[PDB]
């Protein structure tokens, strides 16, 4: 598996981005497996638009 978090929630808590939990559920991103291919364009369309926040989420994913 190799993903260091069990749930999108626990993952988001870890990077202090749990404010965006509802955004992930809205986009039907409910398991960790779903988040692996996110780009900045996908985050934008999720309504996660701030660069800093994108960087935070995307680096975390590369870091898995």
Curated annotation (Swiss-Prot):
SAM domain ranges (all copies): 3-64
Tissue: Overexpressed in several carcinomas.
Phosphotyrosine PTM sites in chain numbering: 20
Posttranslational mods: Phosphorylated. Autophosphorylation is stimulated by its ligand EFNA1. Ubiquitinated.
Compartments in which it is found: Cell membrane
Family: Belongs to the protein kinase superfamily. Tyr protein kinase family. Ephrin receptor subfamily.
Function of the molecule: Receptor tyrosine kinase which binds promiscuously membrane-bound ephrin-A family ligands residing on adjacent cells, leading to contact-dependent bidirectional signaling into neighboring cells. The signaling pathway downstream of the receptor is referred to as forward signaling while the signaling pathway downstream of the ephrin ligand is referred to as reverse signaling. Binds with a low affinity EFNA3 and EFNA4 and with a high affinity to EFNA1 which most probably constitutes its cognate/functional ligand.
Subunit structure: Homodimer. Forms a signaling complex with LCK; PTK2B/PYK2 and PI3-kinase upon activation by EFNA1; regulates T-lymphocytes migration. Interacts (via SAM domain) with ILK (via ANK repeats); stimulated by EFNA1 but independent of the kinase activity of EPHA1. Interacts (kinase activity-dependent) with PTK2/FAK1.
Protein name: Ephrin type-A receptor 1
Gene: EPHA1
Range of the intact protein held here: 911 to 974 of 976
């Amino acid at each position: 598996d190799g993903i260091p978090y069990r749930t999108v929630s626990e993952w988001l808590e870890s990077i202090r981005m749990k404010r965006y939990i509802l955004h992930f559920h809205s986009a039907g991103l409910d398991t960790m497996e779903c988040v692996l291919e996110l780009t900045a364009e996908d985050l934008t369309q999720m309504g996660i638009t701030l660069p800093g926040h994108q960087k935070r989420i995307l680096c975390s994913i590369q870091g898995f």
